């Protein structure tokens, strides 16, 4: 038959929502850092196991209770209220380390205005040395300690890392990036000044060009020689790296960063304009579309990496050995540097990347504004202007350490220390709370009342012992295994692990603080206080 009715209906509407930066930039870097192919199967396994049920649970909670991530626990569990503060701290860390990629992309777009792209050659433009540009057009040999012009450009112009000898010695502040991050923060502040965006017409104009330009880039990379050598590396089973390597932590981090659960974005964006409107048929489709977009982005990235490895006549997993989040600005730059209309396509790609990053960061900073107004509506809910400006100033003051000369040493630290374990333990705590303290039977009855269809046997067993046990096992494996990294011939100092553990603790310590603080205000003995604090607050 092949009616394709599912592809016909609702797909043109769902495909416009799952467009974030966690799938075009975060997924390729994580996949290449752990090897292609051996990461897709654990990724999809962890997804199907603990990302779709949590997504559906958060959507149902936001649709039923209709409250922010700080006010949700006022009707579920008053003890576990520090989850809101943990989510706020996690979002602050995000906005502190997430805007660096946006500033780099804006600087690249600004520098990509000339007719001659700086990423093609390194003929002593500003500061170069030990260059190798002619790959195969002149048929020259490749030797050790040789770098392409793109890597030298990224390392010496947009992120001056030679000024700092490491993380222990940070240099000054580059104004060339501050002048762009200030404009980025001003544009962000001018977009959430009112906070009224539910079904605007801007989605149909900022989500149609990204997809067509991504397909153009895909067909350009496929029409490029040396592409078949990268496809085999992206589709290799490699059952050895699944057994006893520890790839589940990165997969879970990528899942919780790309989907949405963990940052309180779903409970804040879904608590309005929707109530009992065809539930159980949106979260799965959104997750499927997001996974498809992530797979397409990873396929394009690996197709470019295969050509890059075939040109260098080296291994696929040895091209970018210590390169972290710089995988995009190198492979994409080298791919655009071979297109006929290099300048125009580069400008269009950077523009769509900037717009996608803006659309992705507008939802992250919104889950905190609407959350405080639900807990303190007598002081902050009236202004709406002095609070968003204050949080913007706070996020800008905290984003000055990542703008240092050692930027690659700070972004790599807050990437798996403030987002990996923290979001994981926050999700585990909230899931076990909703499962045991609130009761799975009450949640199932509420879902049946608000939708008219009870969840299946697979969903009623996930939040009980499937996702919480998996999250606890991943947390234990992360705490028992050294998460030490390596980047640019300098792995990390000894105190880097302690600094990362302290950073990942200040966001989680809010929950025990509120647990030990709530038991003091309520009078009575220990058991009486526990019984009084377990029951939710009555209206």
């Amino acid at each position: 038959r092949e009616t394709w009715g599912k592809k016909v209906d609702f797909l043109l509407s769902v495909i416009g929502y799952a467009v974030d930066l966690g799938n075009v930039w975060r997924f390729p870097y994580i996949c290449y850092q752990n090897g292609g192919g051996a990461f897709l199967l654990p990724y999809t396994i962890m997804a199907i196991f603990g990302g779709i049920p949590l997504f559906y649970m958060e959507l149902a909670l936001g649709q039923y209770h209709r409250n922010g991530c700080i006010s949700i626990w006022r009707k579920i569990c008053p003890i576990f209220k520090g989850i809101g503060y943990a989510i706020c701290i996690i979002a602050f860390y995000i906005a502190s380390y997430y805007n660096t990629i946006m500033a780099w992309a804006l600087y690249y777009l600004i520098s990509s205005f000339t007719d001659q792209l700086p990423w093609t050659s390194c003929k002593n433009s500003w500061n170069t040395g030990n260059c190798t540009n002619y790959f195969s057009e002149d048929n020259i040999t490749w030797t050790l300690h040789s770098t392409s012009p793109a890597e030298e450009f990224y390392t010496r112009h947009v992120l001056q890392i030679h000024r700092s000898k490491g993380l222990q010695d940070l240099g000054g502040i580059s104004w060339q990036l501050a002048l762009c991050i200030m404009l980025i923060f001003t544009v962000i502040y001018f977009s959430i000044w009112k906070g009224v965006k539910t079904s605007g017409k801007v989605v149909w104009v900022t989500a149609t060009f990204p997809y067509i330009i991504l397909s153009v880039l895909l067909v350009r990379g496929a029409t490029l020689p040396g592409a078949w050598r990268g496809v085999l590396f992206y589709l290799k089973p490699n059952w050895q790296k699944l057994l006893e390597t520890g790839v589940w932590i990165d997969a879970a981090a990528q899942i919780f960063f790309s989907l949405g659960p963990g940052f309180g974005v779903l409970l804040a964006f879904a608590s309005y304009n929707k109530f009992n409107n065809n539930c159980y048929q949106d979260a799965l489709v959104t997750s499927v579309v997001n996974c498809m977009t992530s797979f397409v982005s990873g396929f394009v990235i690996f197709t470019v990496l295969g050509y890059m490895a075939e040109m260098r006549n080296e291994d696929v997993s040895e091209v970018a050995k210590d390169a972290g989040p710089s995988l995009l600005f190198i492979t994409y730059a080298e791919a655009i540097a071979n297109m006929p209309a290099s300048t125009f396509f580069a400008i269009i790609f950077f523009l769509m990347l900037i717009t996608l990053g803006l659309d992705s960061t507008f939802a992250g900073l919104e889950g905190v504004i609407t959350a405080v107004l639900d807990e303190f509506p007598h002081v902050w809910a009236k202004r709406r202007e002095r609070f968003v400006l204050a949080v913007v100033i706070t996020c800008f003051f905290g984003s000055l350490v990542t703008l240092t000369f050692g930027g690659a040493y700070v972004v790599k630290l807050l990437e798996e220390y403030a987002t990996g374990p923290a979001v994981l333990t926050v999700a585990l705590i909230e899931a076990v709370a909703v499962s045991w303290f609130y009761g799975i039977t009450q949640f199932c009855r509420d879902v049946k009342e608000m939708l008219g269809f009870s969840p299946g046997w697979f969903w009623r067993i996930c939040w009980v012992a499937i996702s919480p046990l998996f999250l606890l096992f991943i947390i234990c494996s992360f705490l028992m295994s050294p998460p030490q990294l390596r980047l640019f011939q300098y792995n990390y100092p000894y105190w880097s692990i302690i600094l990362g553990y302290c950073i990942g603790t200040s966001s989680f310590i809010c929950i025990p603080t509120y647990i030990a603080y709530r038991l003091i205000i309520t009078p009575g003995t220990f058991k009486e206080r526990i019984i009084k604090s377990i029951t939710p607050e009555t209206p």
Epitope: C122, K123, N124, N127, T128, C131, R156, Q160, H162
Partner: antibody, heavy 118, light 110 residues
Framework: QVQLQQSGPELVKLGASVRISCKAS????????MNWVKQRPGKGLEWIGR????????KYSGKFKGKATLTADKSSSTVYMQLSSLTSEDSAVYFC??????????????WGQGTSVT | DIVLTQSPASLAVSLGQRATISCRAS??????????LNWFQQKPGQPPKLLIY???NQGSGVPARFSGSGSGTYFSLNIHPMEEDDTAVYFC?????????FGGGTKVEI
Amino acid sequence: QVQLQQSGPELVKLGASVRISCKASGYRFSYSWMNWVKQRPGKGLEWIGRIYPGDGDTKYSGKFKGKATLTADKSSSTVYMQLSSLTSEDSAVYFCARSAYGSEGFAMDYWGQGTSVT
Amino acid sequence: DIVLTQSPASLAVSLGQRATISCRASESVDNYGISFLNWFQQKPGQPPKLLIYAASNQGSGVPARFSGSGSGTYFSLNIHPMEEDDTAVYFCQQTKGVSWTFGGGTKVEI
């Protein structure tokens, strides 16, 4: 070692044109710039322009933008320079200095013997 | 172009004396930590020879007599062990952008 030679002496004729070559050897030719300076008898040095082998860029100082024509040739690695509208003032010595390999951008001390025209 | 002038005009050659040559770079700034400025030396009748590059590093085949110092606008040269062989003309060229120009040159002769 990196050898660098030039042509021999010439004659500056009113209204004619000359051609000075610079054959470099001993390193990567199309990887570093090729400076061209002018030194009048008694006076100091005077920069003319630069040319990167490989059809990449073509720059000048500002006073010889119409009287100097830097031509490269990757076949024999001999950089040329064709002057136009000569006079009694252009009677000087033209050298050929190879630039550095990037960041520093200094002269690698591989200067020619000098093409003293008269 | 970046105007670069030298304040000294002519020094005196003396055994065991310090020589100071400075270049005016009022319109100049450091780009990536290395000062885009070089020091040359041209003997009478001989082609110019590289002496000190980047104003901090020593060139090729140059003794430890010449030592550069300074960053940003002002620069200096240390010619403390000056013998009768160091009688030449030293120039000053900057390599910031497309502004490559030489200086006036200071000849040393007693």
